[PDB]
Design a binder for this molecule. Structure first.
Ligand SMILES: Nc1ncnc2c1ncn2[C@@H]1O[C@H](COP(=O)(O)OP(=O)(O)OP(=O)(O)O)[C@@H](O)[C@H]1O
Ligand SMILES: Nc1ncnc2c1ncn2[C@@H]1O[C@H](COP(=O)(O)OP(=O)(O)OP(=O)(O)O)[C@@H](O)[C@H]1O
Ligand SMILES: Nc1ncnc2c1ncn2[C@@H]1O[C@H](COP(=O)(O)OP(=O)(O)OP(=O)(O)O)[C@@H](O)[C@H]1O
Lengths: 293, 293, 293
């Protein structure tokens, strides 16, 4: 019943499914299977050179941050497989156009875009789609105002079965851009290595919830059913929140150990387990149409 | 029975109370209530422009880091409401005078104070009540020796019902002073955004426990009953501990996911839940006078 | 039955043992016993000036990172006490010779060694057994290429009773070399103060598992039974993994709150509890010879 590609957050996903009593199926490549085959959370392990076998019947596919990189956006939207939570939404985090449209539509403050009209020098900027340059600026992308100050990744789960928006965690990325923390040397790459669970100052959560609620509303318009399971808003905290992006699926920073879900449930429960519980709840109520695609 | 202001650590507090079987009441403002009303952990939700409605009968108020900012110290000490753990103690973290008196009285090493007798330049200093300056020094506060090196926030819970001091966690603040970690730019504000739970090197805990025990002793003198529930000692680890402050109530870094409590209990249990269990234990033993005010 | 020295990770160890139903015995010094005697997880508390009382019969000693510093390597290998997981292995993390031998034997990439043939200046290096210098280089050790970029400590548990390698967590050290993260000042000491649990990007785990499997294989040769319980590989992530060291016993970064174990078990379970469950499994199957020394 529950299957997905081996990478990104399939561990969290499968463990949560096997936890909710569902059966497990993982599509993995020959190089990566040694590790995953040693895991007691996988029942059916489908080894393959390519993951394009998205004809996975029977089960619900449950996407993550590797699906587009392993399969085009086209293939997925026209895929035969069942799929968890909308599916037309997945593309909304893929381009600036869609990302802006939604964030603007929700009223969420975003980092300002900068077209070559700097303040050379000592006026550095961030170049997205990364890397940051100074005055010069000479050398598909966008230029943004450089903002120093903790980057927070808020995880949400809107549930149709319960008709509520759940703020389930706040992540902080572990970038290779460290080793400067100990002793700064030169600009390093912003590639993520891992994620740190962080307990946000409580006085900021209400604001994020409002932004989240607004996001759900406009997405319900902009893309018919609009946001069924997990999603994330990415922010730069200046001391005034500016949105830098979104996650149209389980973010990844959700692999970190967040609590919060304990606010809606008696038990902890991760994002991957939340998705599975959403599935199980739909089953027991003949819903299940409201959460898939 | 259990109520408190919506902010700081009311989430942790209410969840822990509802976990110990207590009833829940939250005082929240109109702007922040959307978020909190969607939480299954609140039973009675008292919306209000101002929180000055501290006539809350029936229940136990349970204070946190917002109470003085929402209500003066005067009002609270003369408040009518029941209140968890002492109450005269809450003011001891409010001024240098009280902070020093207690820390000195407990024999705890504190960061040295510096009156304009620098070592200009490259001799930077920290200015409290923040911000750090260099040589110049020109431009209610105190000047302290600048100390680089992990800032640890130790959480304690002295319980009368059990007559023991519990070391329940060690927090690390997430400041906006980051984004320098990746690439240093300029001195940033030290405002906290969140908290990270950290497993301290075990060889350092005994020392902290000793300082904690001593703190309880002198507070039992300096302020009659002295320290009934949660409190925290703030340190700068040079490789030799220097106290920089204290928390005369639930600190906030306690929102992070700490274990430790598992050393006194079979189960995890947060600080907010610890306060509630203290309450329930008192109830079942007709104590309850020993833990309130 | 289960005893060990009070420091490093004895808290984790004892709690896990008391959790698996085992009895607990802690050897502690007079100065540190106040703290440990207040802990409900210790049954028999053996106070002593020196820990050289390694004649501990009845129980299984379970070593950690303080054993060699409290007792020589000689004494331990010829010790009378029972001891958990091999014991001849414990010395393999003690010297470069052994560390290299093993890492080379497993085909694990290691940080390159540098003999005075720098690139003075701005070409800084790390000096192990710490501290980092620049061009000059003038002033038992080794010199390594300086590498900036998150240091990861992977925790493993090879179990004979189950004949499998378990990747149970990834730690990140909290060094005093911080306070530079907020605002860089001067090169600080790399002494650890604590540990942060980190959820590693899932695409990197398979690679570490492979290195781990290989480590087990060669250790099974290089040191007869080779690696029975916990061990750790230390890396520098450049974006291409370079080994900097190993832990021939429970690492310490295992005191942090890791999940992962939930992949092999339905429950969380720490490393200290993992060692204890290994013991209990052996008991129930008359094995117990396969996991002790
Ligand atoms: N406007 C900005 N100013 C300064 N730094 C920034 C800015 N935007 C992003 N960053 C840096 O990059 C990090 C966030 O990267 P981000 O999560 O946006 O990458 P990404 O969009 O997920 O990459 P991809 O689109 O390929 O998945 C932060 O840690 C931050 O330090
Ligand atoms: N003596 C010092 N030297 C260098 N940095 C310091 C010093 N004291 C504090 N800091 C910095 O500030 C942070 C601690 O701030 P702190 O917790 O003392 O603020 P605060 O007292 O809680 O503010 P408030 O009193 O309004 O609640 C640390 O992260 C540290 O980097
Ligand atoms: N090759 C290197 N280049 C740059 N920094 C390094 C290098 N090796 C180690 N470090 C720094 O030191 C830290 C790792 O220290 P490490 O864990 O190797 O000490 P240690 O070997 O455990 O000390 P001990 O042997 O006494 O137990 C990292 O945080 C990293 O910043």
């Amino acid at each position: 019943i529950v299957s997905t590609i081996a990478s990104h957050s399939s561990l969290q996903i499968l463990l949560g499914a096997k936890k909710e009593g569902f059966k497990t199926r993982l599509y993995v490549s020959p190089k990566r299977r040694p590790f995953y085959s040693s895991l007691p959370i996988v029942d059916d392990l489908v080894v393959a050179e390519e993951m394009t076998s998205i004809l996975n019947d029977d089960g619900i596919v449950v996407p993550h941050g590797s699906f587009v990189a392993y399969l085009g956006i086209e293939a997925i939207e026209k895929a035969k497989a069942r799929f968890f939570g909308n599916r037309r939404f997945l593309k909304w985090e893929t381009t600036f156009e869609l990302q802006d449209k939604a964030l603007e539509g929700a009223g969420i403050p975003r980092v300002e875009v900068v077209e070559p009209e700097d303040a050379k020098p000592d006026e550095l900027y961030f170049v997205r789609i990364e890397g940051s340059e100074l005055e010069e600026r000479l050398s598909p992308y966008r230029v943004e105002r450089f903002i120093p100050g903790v980057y927070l990744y808020v995880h949400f789960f809107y549930s149709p079965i319960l008709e509520r928006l759940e703020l389930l965690g706040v992540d902080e990325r572990v970038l290779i851009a460290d080793g400067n923390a100990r002793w700064p040397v030169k600009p390093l790459p912003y590639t993520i290595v891992g994620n740190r669970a962080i307990a946000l100052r409580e006085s900021l959560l209400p604001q994020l919830y409002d932004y989240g609620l607004a996001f759900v509303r406009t997405m319900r318009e902009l893309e018919p059913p609009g946001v069924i399971g997990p999603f994330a808003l990415h922010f730069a905290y200046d001391g005034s929140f500016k949105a830098i992006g979104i996650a149209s699926r389980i973010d990844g920073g959700s692999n970190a150990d967040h609590w919060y879900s304990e606010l809606y449930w008696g038990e902890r429960l991760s994002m991957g387990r939340r998705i599975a519980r959403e599935l199980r709840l739909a089953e027991e109520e003949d819903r299940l149409e409201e959460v898939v695609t």
